[PDB]
Structure formats: structure tokens, C-alpha cells
Amino acid sequence: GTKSVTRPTRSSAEITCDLTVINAFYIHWYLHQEGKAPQRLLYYDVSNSKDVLESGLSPGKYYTHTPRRWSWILILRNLIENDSGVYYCATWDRGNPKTHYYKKLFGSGTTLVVTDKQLDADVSPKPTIFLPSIAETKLQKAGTYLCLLEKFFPDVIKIHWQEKKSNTILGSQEGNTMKTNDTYMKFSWLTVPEESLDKEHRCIVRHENNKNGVDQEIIFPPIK
Amino acid sequence: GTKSVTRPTRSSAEITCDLTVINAFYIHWYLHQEGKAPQRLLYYDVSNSKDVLESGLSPGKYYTHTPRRWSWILILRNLIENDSGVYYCATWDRGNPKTHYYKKLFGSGTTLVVTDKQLDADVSPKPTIFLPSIAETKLQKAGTYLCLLEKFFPDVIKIHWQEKKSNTILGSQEGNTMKTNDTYMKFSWLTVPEESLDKEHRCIVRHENNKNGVDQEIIFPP
Amino acid sequence: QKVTQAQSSVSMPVRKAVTLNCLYETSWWSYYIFWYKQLPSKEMIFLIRQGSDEQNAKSGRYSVNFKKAAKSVALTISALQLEDSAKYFCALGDPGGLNTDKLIFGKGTRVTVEPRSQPHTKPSVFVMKNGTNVACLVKEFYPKDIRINLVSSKKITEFDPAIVISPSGKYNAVKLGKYEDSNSVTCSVQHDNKTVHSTDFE
Amino acid sequence: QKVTQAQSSVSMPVRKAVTLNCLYETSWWSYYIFWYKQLPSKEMIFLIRQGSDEQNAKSGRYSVNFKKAAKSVALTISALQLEDSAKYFCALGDPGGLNTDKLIFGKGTRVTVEPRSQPHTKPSVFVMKNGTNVACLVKEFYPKDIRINLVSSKKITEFDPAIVISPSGKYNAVKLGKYEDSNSVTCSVQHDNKTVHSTDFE
């Protein structure tokens, strides 16, 4: 599950990469910016513990830190606005499909946003519940309800629909993130069949700036 | 309140700073080895974010990390047996006692031990309780009673006595750490006046390999 | 070296086949060809490998032909699927034989899969509200060229609803907004040269 | 530069004064001298500063005698206490006038403070036990020299005394050990040319 790291200027950030490699020998780092291409940036050898920069990169900008066995991290220093993008993590493994040819397996990515404003404190998403119209259930015996989120930063977000009983996420419909006065807003909706009108159903969001670091919980009362 | 960090060879370690300074320009680090002198290893420039090593010290060995504002850590690479000692933090400030003369202030110190054996798993201080003899109480109208801890590695440890009602530390007496076949052991004792013979008392130990990393609390019946 | 991907957006109907172009200028003797895949959650998946002296690659629905003269590689998917909409990449292994190498990537050719022909269907219009903001839901319609106007006195903000594809086969839409006179607001929907209101459903 | 501390341990009793020696060699025109102090829990505490052109330092119970010609500095502690037992260091500020200089450290002279002279007193011998291992607690006694012993048919392990100063002013002691038959184990103590048993305190 992709994440998001947000930091100001003249500061440092930590990017963690989550592969599960046993007989690891090398760990290559990358970067994929918008409109550009994914390009390698350095790499690191497990046995000798040394950083091998690329041509043109100033020393003292990228560090790899191992905090326990088979655990790796990349640390960035002196952040400028050109640092932002998506960062990966690779090793040559043969491999996840267990084949004979060395193919570079990739991580999952992390978005880094370098800001300068730090204006408003609470930039956590603010829910709003739209109660379905009972007239809709009269014709086709189906209810549709809309979940609206507003005032969040950055634009990385997640939406799920639960039923409070099982760990199965219901298939639903999704909008599009739209920018409203330097902050984003989004919504999604789900349809309930007639057979589950009396059952309660749930919707959770996953955002970097959630309160207490835990997923926000939205509880929808059953339709009467 | 010195801590301790225990790691094997061919691995890395972190030493956490302890000072709280907000107008800080440079951050220096020191090392104190056994029988030798304390010597500075490097220092750090806050604004430009640069390390300045010392002569004979290979690059790619000490990295200073800052995870948030006014928070610093030292990371050490490729540990060898000659790395063990006590590490400090220091800055030039004028100062703690509201002085006028620039004088360096030191942190708290952290002991690092580098091992090779990794023999045992249960290496936390195990308790054993000593109840006072019936003779002692009757003649002298006082009680003195003992706590014994043993089989812990490393040898850094603390001990306090509490009375379960007040947040005041009692004044007990302390032995010495004695090596017992690649482990360590230690005991302490406290005297109790008769007026508190009915009361309850505690003994708490701060050791690195405590279970879940929390202080042990030992309850002795009245 | 250099890798080129000229296309920037493609769209093909369901159950057809596509083809993407990759031209590479190299100066080595042995190399390997890799095609990749990225989902909109920023996740990179290995797709297929060609090889230098190997025959034409074929792994399931993925078929690759190789031209060693002009150094051109073409990627073709046999059967399309709605979840196949993802950027595809061309990666050059130099030399592709050690564990200390690197890769060079193209720029990416995004594909989009659109639903096939379906009969015309009448939109059903509903309205729900909360507080000040109101939104009128629009059920299935086909064409996708539906313009919705909300009749009211004081306007605050408008938004573009949706072009979302439902899994039955017909698109859906949800238009948001807020109005000062939130007591009763309806929206007018016109599709296939006919206009359907919202109040006629009750 | 170089800093020398010749001594390695001293011993003074209470309410007395001690003096420690430090010799240095340097080639600067101005410098500063610092005296530090380390507790057994590893804490460094600033004590006093000398200075190149400053007169003799005098700050509470710490005073410094400065020898400019011979490059010698000595620290005097006036009235000792029981909490003054710690290592002391001599540090050279090189040159110690900016925000980027360092310090050169000596090796440290440990001091120890012993209790004042008091008339003799008789130990009281008690024994406590648990399971197998049994200790014998020896209550307040004077002077320190003592030879306590646990007499039993069998023994397994045995440890040294833990003679420790008590807040009263007279030492206490604890000796441990584990015995196969701990039911009948008693402590015999020979102090001040006379013997005290534990069975005469029942």
C-alpha cells in the first residue's frame, strides 16, 4: 500500500522500503518523476556496507541505514522542491516466480511532497454523510448513499466500503480528486441491494494526516 | 541515568542525544575508552548540514541523523570490538547556570558493548526474596530485608525501593557486581522501622533486557 | 544508451489487440529486453522478457516479436480486459547478466479500455441533500454526452460530475454543488435528444 | 597538545582538604583551563574555569592555583563530604574562544573519602534464608577489619563480604552463600579480638 511523506524545505526525510529478501546481495534505489522517466540514483552492497553514488551527485545527500538484519532505509538531506516524486527499491532476485533468470523485483513506492507554506493546522479529511432518499427505494428497491471528504492535503487517499461483519470490501464507485483553493476534496458512493437493507455498512479512509495515525471510521446507520 | 546498547560484530548502532538546546549551531561527539582519555571524534554544522571528521578516521563510518527539529542521533557502521566505551554529546553554551563564559555542556553518556558469544536468551535480572528472621524483629523492633538479582548481561543496572503509597525513593544500601561465569549478579538491602512493618514496599530495577522494556516491580509482603 | 517510446496515450475497445513501439540505440553485444507494468496505485510489476538469441516471446496472452535489424520490439496483448488499463514500460538490460547492473526505461504508453456497444438506455434522476450542499444522482446512460443543469436562485460552486463506468456496461454520474436556497432544488437531464426531469419519478 | 595527570588514586577522610596536580604544554598565546567531574553513573559536571590572563579562581568550595611559568595547575577542595568521591579531569581549551574548538583531556585522578574516627562497637549477627541460599547480616561494627564466616557441614558457593558505610557512620556487612542443608547454618564473627555467635541472639 502506497504511502506519503510530507516535509518542508531545508530539512530531511526518511523513505523505508519493504521487500522480503533472504539471500540479499545488493539494493538499488530509483526515482520516477512526472513527465520524466524512472532513473537509478545509487545502490548499496550488503557485505561491505558502502554507498556507491552516481555521476554528478554531490556527496552527503543520500544515505542507506540498516537498523536490524534484513531491514533497509534511505535517508535524504537538504530537501529542495526538485526532490519530490516516487521512490522505489529493487534487488536482482530469481525470484518471486522462482525462475532461472535474474529479474529485478520492485518495491511499492512512496510519494514525497516538499512544501513551503505550513499554513493551516488541521488538514485532515472532514466527512459528510448524505442520507439516501426513501423515494429511491420505492421504484427499484435499491438505496444509494454518498460519502464526501473535504479539506485534505496532499492528494493521496484511499476509500473502502465495509459491512461491519466480514473482512470483505464491497465494490463501489469512485470520483476524482479536485483542487479547491489549494486543498483537495473527493467523494465516493455505494449501492445496497434490497436483501441487505437491514445490515449496517462501513466506509474507511486512509490518509497520511489522519488523527492519531489511525484510519478514520465512518459508520452508516441501516436504512429504515 | 546512563543507558546501554549491546550489539554484535558486523552490525550498526545508534546513540541518542539528550540535550535540549534550541539555538544550536554545532554538535560535537566524544568517546571515553577504558583507562584512556576522552577524545573528540567529529562535529556537525547545523545550518549547512555537514560532518567534519578527524584525521585517520575513514569516511563512511559516522553519520549524524536528525529525524525532527532539534533532535540528533549518531549512527555507527561496521562494529568491531575496539568500538566499546561511553559516547557523549556536547555544545558550547553560556550556559546552564546562567553564566557569561562560553563553556561546553555534556550529555548523559551511553555504554556500548560489542559481543561475539550470544549464548543465553533469558538475560534479565531474576529476583529472589529474603524475609527477615523472626529473632531480628523482636529484640530490636526493626526489620531489615534483602533483594537479590542475578544472571544478567550486560552489567549496567539500577535499583530503587518504594513504599507503594508515596512517590519518594527510600534510602537503601548497595553491594557490588560480581562476575559469575560470563554473567553478573547483585543484591541490595533496606532497613524498615517498626512503624512501617504493616506497610507494603517495592523494589524496582532498570535494565536493558527487561521484558517488554519496562521496569520490573517487586512486591514484598508486609 | 537511449530508449524511445513515442506514443503517450492509446485507447482500444474490448476483446481487441494492441501494439506498442520500442526502439533502442545500443552498442553492446549481448542484451535482454524487459517489458513492465504500473498500476495507478504506483506499483511496478514485471511482465515479460525477450532475450537476444531466443525465439519470439510468448507468455499467455502476451506475444512479442523481435527485430534485430532495426532494433524494434513490439508488445501485443491477445485478449483485452477492463483491468488492463495501465502504463507499460520498455527496459534495457545492460548487459543484463550480473547483479550489479542497472536498467534504462522508456517513458510509458498508457492504454485505456472502453466498453463495447450497448443499447440506448434512459437515465433515471434522483436528488439527495444534507445541510446546504445538494447533489443529484444520475443512473445509467449511454451516450456519455449528458449535460446536467440545476435550477436554483443562488449559486455557490459547481463541479464536473463523473464519467464513471458501472460494471453492468452503462456509465453513471454524480454531480455535486451547494446552493443558498437548499430547500428544494432539482436538476434537468437531457440524453438522446430528450429531457428527463427528476420530479416525475414520484 | 598534551595534558598530564600523574596521580591515579588518593584517599582522604572527612572534613579534610585534598589537592590534585595537572601539567600541560602548549604553544598558543591565550587559552582556557576547565576542571570536570564524573559520577559512577557516567555524568560530566562543569566545576570551574581558569583562563590565561585571569587571576586565581575562587568559586565556592573550589579554588585553583595557577602556575604560568611552569605550566602547572592544581585544584583544591576545601571541606570534603561523602559525595565527593569521583574522578576529576583536567581539560585544555584549544584555544577555546570560538564555537568550533575542542578540548584535550587528561586521564583522571580518582579520589575516595573514608569515615571519621570513632570508638569501637560490637556487631550484632543475624541470619536470614530462602530455599537453599542463606545470608548472614552483620549489623553495625567498627573498625572495618572483620572476618565473618558461615559454618556448615556442606557448601557449594560462597562470596566476599560487602562492607558498606552506613548513614550512622559505622559499617554494615553481608555475606552470602548456598548450602546443601540450610536448616542448620549459623554465622560466626571474629571482630576486635573477640568472637560473636548468632545463636546467642536468639
Side-chain angles (χ1 to χ4, degrees), chain A residues 1-39 41-224, chain B residues 1-185 187-216 218-222, chain C residues 1-143 145-202, chain D residues 1-129 131-197 199-202:
Chain A
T2 183
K3 311 157 65 291
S4 151
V5 188
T6 303
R7 223 62 79 197
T9 30
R10 305 223 326 152
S11 80
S12 56
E14 290 105 285
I15 285 130
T16 300
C17 88
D18 46 53
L19 300 119
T20 59
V21 187
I22 39 169
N23 319 100
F25 290 100
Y26 300 97
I27 317 288
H28 327 261
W29 297 100
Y30 278 67
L31 166 57
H32 169 81
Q33 261 154 334
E34 50 61 38
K36 302 186 183 70
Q39 62 167 7
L41 207 157
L42 67 152
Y43 86 100
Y44 172 89
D45 40 358
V46 291
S47 188
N48 299 4
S49 193
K50 208 72 69 152
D51 262 337
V52 198
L53 259 67
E54 218 94 340
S55 328
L57 307 168
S58 69
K61 179 75 190 176
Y62 301 99
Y63 183 92
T64 306
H65 171 44
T66 172
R68 89 194 95 259
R69 291 173 296 185
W70 317 114
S71 173
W72 307 279
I73 283 175
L74 191 82
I75 308 181
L76 265 82
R77 201 201 272 195
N78 261 311
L79 285 186
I80 53 168
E81 316 233 14
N82 315 49
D83 282 309
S84 36
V86 177
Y87 291 79
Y88 283 78
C89 215
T91 86
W92 284 91
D93 212 58
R94 50 156 183 167
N96 210 6
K98 198 200 291 183
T99 64
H100 56 281
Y101 44 94
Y102 287 87
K103 52 226 172 170
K104 236 169 147 181
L105 275 274
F106 268 92
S108 282
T110 289
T111 306
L112 162 68
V113 194
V114 181
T115 76
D116 209 11
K117 295 178 283 187
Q118 285 84 240
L119 298 179
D120 201 74
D122 186 72
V123 282
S124 53
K126 259 87 79 167
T128 284
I129 303 270
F130 272 39
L131 209 68
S133 76
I134 28 73
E136 183 183 3
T137 67
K138 184 177 180 181
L139 273 81
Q140 217 164 357
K141 300 175 290 298
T144 57
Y145 39 75
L146 163 146
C147 182
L148 173 75
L149 282 309
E150 214 188 335
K151 300 281 182 294
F152 57 90
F153 195 118
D155 63 298
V156 198
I157 217 80
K158 264 293 296 300
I159 282 311
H160 282 286
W161 273 98
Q162 277 82 229
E163 61 184 358
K164 207 184 174 185
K165 272 204 174 185
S166 179
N167 275 308
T168 304
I169 287 99
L170 311 163
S172 64
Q173 321 273 321
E174 221 208 321
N176 212 355
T177 323
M178 293 135 33
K179 163 190 275 212
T180 81
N181 289 117
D182 79 29
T183 300
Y184 305 71
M185 56 100 45
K186 202 171 171 75
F187 49 78
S188 67
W189 53 94
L190 171 62
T191 302
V192 159
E194 191 186 5
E195 58 180 358
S196 64
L197 292 173
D198 50 351
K199 191 170 173 173
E200 210 166 17
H201 44 39
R202 265 251 307 292
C203 172
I204 61 153
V205 319
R206 190 158 89 184
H207 186 252
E208 181 204 358
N209 287 115
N210 256 328
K211 55 173 285 186
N212 220 3
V214 199
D215 316 48
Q216 258 190 9
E217 269 301 356
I218 295 315
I219 290 100
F220 264 88
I223 180 61
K224 296 177 183 177
Chain B
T2 279
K3 334 167 46 58
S4 87
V5 202
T6 291
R7 346 281 308 170
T9 49
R10 302 253 88 179
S11 307
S12 163
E14 298 158 75
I15 276 79
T16 302
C17 213
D18 293 292
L19 289 83
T20 61
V21 50
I22 53 179
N23 282 313
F25 292 104
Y26 302 100
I27 300 292
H28 315 81
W29 294 85
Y30 283 74
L31 166 64
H32 194 119
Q33 270 199 332
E34 287 63 36
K36 311 188 191 71
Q39 54 172 5
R40 177 168 103 188
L41 286 171
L42 59 107
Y43 80 93
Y44 188 80
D45 197 355
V46 156
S47 326
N48 297 23
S49 205
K50 33 167 280 273
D51 274 329
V52 194
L53 242 54
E54 285 263 349
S55 57
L57 275 56
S58 85
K61 184 76 181 166
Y62 310 122
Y63 177 66
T64 297
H65 174 37
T66 165
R68 76 176 195 265
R69 279 175 294 177
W70 324 121
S71 176
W72 300 282
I73 290 176
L74 181 75
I75 316 174
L76 322 154
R77 213 175 213 157
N78 260 316
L79 289 177
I80 54 163
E81 315 254 12
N82 221 296
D83 280 312
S84 34
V86 186
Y87 293 84
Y88 287 72
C89 273
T91 94
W92 279 90
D93 72 278
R94 48 149 192 174
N96 202 356
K98 205 175 292 185
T99 67
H100 77 103
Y101 42 85
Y102 276 84
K103 51 102 157 162
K104 205 185 262 253
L105 264 63
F106 279 82
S108 256
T110 298
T111 291
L112 163 77
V113 331
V114 189
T115 81
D116 174 271
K117 297 166 280 187
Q118 275 87 238
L119 291 173
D120 206 80
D122 40 290
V123 202
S124 49
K126 331 247 182 73
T128 288
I129 45 93
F130 272 39
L131 270 311
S133 71
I134 61 195
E136 170 180 12
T137 63
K138 56 145 169 103
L139 305 105
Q140 221 148 357
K141 297 175 287 294
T144 287
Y145 89 105
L146 202 97
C147 198
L148 173 84
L149 305 125
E150 62 166 48
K151 243 151 199 193
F152 57 93
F153 177 176
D155 80 63
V156 206
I157 209 153
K158 262 293 292 300
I159 274 146
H160 300 280
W161 286 88
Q162 276 111 342
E163 63 187 322
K164 207 182 174 183
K165 277 199 176 183
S166 181
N167 292 321
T168 307
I169 297 268
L170 298 167
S172 66
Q173 258 162 1
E174 204 247 326
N176 265 8
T177 323
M178 299 135 197
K179 153 141 188 313
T180 93
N181 286 107
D182 72 76
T183 36
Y184 292 84
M185 79 145 42
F187 54 76
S188 45
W189 61 88
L190 167 63
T191 203
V192 172
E194 191 184 6
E195 68 187 2
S196 324
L197 243 299
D198 53 353
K199 211 159 186 174
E200 214 160 11
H201 285 281
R202 280 110 44 95
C203 198
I204 56 155
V205 319
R206 175 148 64 199
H207 189 75
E208 183 202 330
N209 305 18
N210 267 329
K211 269 72 183 53
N212 209 10
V214 212
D215 292 359
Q216 281 186 358
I218 312 154
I219 303 273
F220 277 96
Chain C
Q1 296 84 107
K2 286 205 91 272
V3 183
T4 31
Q5 271 172 338
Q7 299 90 76
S8 285
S9 292
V10 199
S11 296
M12 305 291 255
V14 189
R15 258 156 286 176
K16 285 191 178 182
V18 214
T19 292
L20 282 313
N21 300 317
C22 181
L23 284 132
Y24 61 97
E25 295 47 20
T26 181
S27 66
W28 283 79
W29 216 89
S30 292
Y31 36 55
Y32 268 115
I33 281 315
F34 287 130
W35 282 97
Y36 274 166
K37 179 174 179 179
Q38 193 199 14
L39 306 181
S41 71
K42 309 294 221 297
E43 187 195 4
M44 200 79 76
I45 279 77
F46 153 84
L47 272 190
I48 209 174
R49 151 175 169 260
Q50 168 42 265
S52 297
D53 300 6
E54 282 66 30
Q55 299 178 356
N56 278 336
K58 185 183 184 297
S59 175
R61 333 177 289 151
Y62 290 83
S63 61
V64 161
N65 62 24
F66 186 40
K67 260 56 135 164
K68 204 150 173 19
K71 295 175 183 175
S72 179
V73 210
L75 180 50
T76 278
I77 310 161
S78 77
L80 269 165
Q81 167 231 38
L82 287 320
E83 271 85 3
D84 281 340
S85 312
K87 294 172 78 69
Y88 296 171
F89 283 73
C90 201
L92 179 64
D94 90 326
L98 269 310
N99 303 357
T100 326
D101 300 331
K102 73 175 174 293
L103 296 186
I104 312 281
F105 293 102
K107 273 195 175 176
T109 76
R110 200 198 314 265
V111 323
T112 306
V113 178
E114 47 190 357
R116 60 181 180 87
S117 64
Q118 290 293 106
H120 295 252
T121 295
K122 215 272 294 190
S124 184
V125 191
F126 295 83
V127 164
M128 49 210 115
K129 60 182 69 174
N130 178 342
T132 304
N133 37 9
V134 69
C136 79
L137 180 136
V138 184
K139 223 79 166 184
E140 309 178 359
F141 40 85
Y142 182 164
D145 185 73
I146 270 65
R147 53 112 208 83
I148 316 135
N149 34 299
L150 292 47
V151 188
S152 179
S153 297
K154 301 299 291 295
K155 62 179 76 68
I156 306 170
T157 325
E158 249 277 352
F159 307 107
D160 306 24
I163 310 125
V164 155
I165 295 67
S166 100
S168 60
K170 267 86 72 176
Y171 305 173
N172 293 32
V174 167
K175 195 165 192 183
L176 266 282
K178 50 172 39 68
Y179 302 88
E180 184 171 1
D181 40 291
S182 67
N183 38 319
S184 65
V185 169
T186 183
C187 72
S188 178
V189 174
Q190 168 216 91
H191 156 258
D192 274 340
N193 287 314
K194 82 208 52 162
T195 291
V196 187
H197 253 289
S198 71
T199 59
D200 49 350
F201 289 87
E202 306 301 319
Chain D
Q1 284 50 9
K2 210 199 122 70
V3 161
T4 37
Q5 266 171 337
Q7 295 160 80
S8 282
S9 294
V10 309
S11 292
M12 209 70 15
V14 178
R15 214 121 47 241
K16 277 205 181 179
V18 85
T19 299
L20 305 164
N21 293 309
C22 168
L23 299 144
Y24 66 97
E25 52 149 89
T26 193
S27 69
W28 286 89
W29 287 345
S30 291
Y31 37 56
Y32 287 106
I33 294 274
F34 304 124
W35 278 94
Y36 272 66
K37 159 181 179 174
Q38 199 194 12
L39 301 185
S41 72
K42 319 302 215 310
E43 167 180 3
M44 284 257 161
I45 302 130
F46 165 80
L47 288 177
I48 203 171
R49 204 187 64 168
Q50 176 34 39
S52 306
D53 287 325
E54 285 193 350
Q55 293 171 353
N56 291 114
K58 185 183 183 297
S59 169
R61 296 196 299 118
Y62 302 98
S63 270
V64 162
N65 200 7
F66 185 49
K67 273 81 62 178
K68 55 183 183 179
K71 297 323 179 71
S72 174
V73 58
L75 183 71
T76 301
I77 315 171
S78 80
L80 276 167
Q81 298 182 1
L82 267 275
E83 279 84 6
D84 286 349
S85 72
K87 289 175 76 75
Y88 287 48
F89 291 77
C90 197
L92 184 75
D94 178 68
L98 268 304
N99 260 51
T100 333
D101 336 271
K102 69 175 185 299
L103 295 178
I104 310 268
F105 274 115
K107 285 210 174 183
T109 69
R110 178 184 292 276
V111 330
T112 315
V113 174
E114 45 192 356
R116 49 184 170 88
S117 66
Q118 291 286 99
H120 299 252
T121 321
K122 279 312 293 322
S124 174
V125 184
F126 301 105
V127 290
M128 344 180 295
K129 45 191 65 179
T132 292
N133 52 80
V134 18
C136 94
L137 177 98
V138 171
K139 286 281 200 122
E140 297 170 350
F141 57 82
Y142 206 106
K144 157 176 220 258
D145 192 71
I146 188 165
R147 192 183 67 191
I148 74 194
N149 154 15
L150 314 156
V151 47
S152 179
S153 297
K154 289 293 297 299
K155 65 175 70 66
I156 295 167
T157 323
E158 212 280 4
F159 298 108
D160 290 80
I163 297 120
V164 162
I165 286 151
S166 138
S168 66
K170 330 198 325 302
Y171 307 76
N172 300 36
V174 165
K175 203 160 199 178
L176 237 150
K178 44 175 55 183
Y179 300 98
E180 181 179 0
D181 37 354
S182 62
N183 48 5
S184 67
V185 177
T186 187
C187 215
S188 181
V189 166
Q190 219 276 123
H191 172 69
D192 230 8
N193 281 313
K194 75 206 50 172
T195 165
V196 176
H197 293 242
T199 54
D200 64 343
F201 280 95
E202 304 298 318

